[PDB]
Amino acid sequence: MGSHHHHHHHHHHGSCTVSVNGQGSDANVYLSPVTLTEVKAAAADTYLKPKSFTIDVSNCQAADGTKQDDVSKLGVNWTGGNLLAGATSKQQGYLANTEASGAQNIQLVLSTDNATALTNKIIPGDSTQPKAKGDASAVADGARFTYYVGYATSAPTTVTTGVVNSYATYEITYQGGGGGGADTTVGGGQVNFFGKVTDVS
């Protein structure tokens, strides 16, 4: 209780390394598939077989090139991506297709747990977004963050087949819930997704 109202300085940060799933700070990654029936038989906006992902972040330093100790204050924030046009509250957090010949009502999602509980889905523009939470042991002097992907759609009764390819964009931030309160951009990175249906026509 008390302290930290005068005689303090909390951050000075300039840059970091980020690495997605065994790539660099820019990453392509193949998505988890569905069967011809599993896509139409999945329920509207429900959970299914995700894919599990990690961001390694290192060399976290000042504008002066000096590397630091802030390994509990750090966390990922999602800035944007190829998001769903005309989305409603249930459909918020959804990634649309770049394939013109691909699937229509089928999207990707961002979430914290995903495998039985996808309903904790994440939106880039929303202040309710949780930051991903770093493991200081999993990197030499920085920390490692965790996230997931799965499907969603409003209408399985209107679902199409093919491919669905997309992307999301991120930044690294300081102490506070996502971008909430005072902040500084510690780093950032870029991840591209590549999904499809099995045995396609």
Spell out the blueprint of helices and strands.
Blueprint: E1 13-20, E2 26-30, H1 38-41, E3 51-62, E4 75-81, E5 94-95, E6 107-111, E7 132-133, E8 143-152, E9 163-173, E10 187-196
Parallel strand pairs: 2-10
Antiparallel strand pairs: 1-3, 3-8, 4-7, 4-9, 5-6, 6-8, 9-10
Detailed description of the structure:
The protein has 201 residues and is mostly beta strands. The protein has one domain (13-196): Fimbrial-type adhesion domain (Immunoglobulin-like, Sandwich). The protein is 2% helix and 36% strand. It has one helix and ten strands; from the N terminus they run ββαββββββββ. The strands form two sheets. A five-stranded antiparallel beta sheet has the order 1-3-8-6-5, with no helix packed on it. It has a five-stranded mixed beta sheet with strand order 2-10-9-4-7, with no helix packed on it. The longest helix has 4 residues, at 38-41. It is elongated, with a radius of gyration of 19 Å. It is classed as cell adhesion. The entry lists the keywords Type 3 fimbriae, biofilm formation.
Number of domains: 1
Number of helices: 1
SSE series: EEHEEEEEEEE
Helix amount, in percent? under 10%
Terminal CA distance reads: 64 Å
Strand content: 35-45%
CATH superfamily: Fimbrial-type adhesion domain
Q: What is the structural class?
A: mainly beta
Please give the CATH architecture. Sandwich
Would you count the extended β strands for me? 10
What's the alpha carbon Rg, rounded to whole Å? 19 Å
Form type: elongated
Family: Belongs to the fimbrial protein family.
GO cellular component, one term: pilus
Subcellular location: Fimbrium
GO biological process, one term: cell adhesion involved in single-species biofilm formation
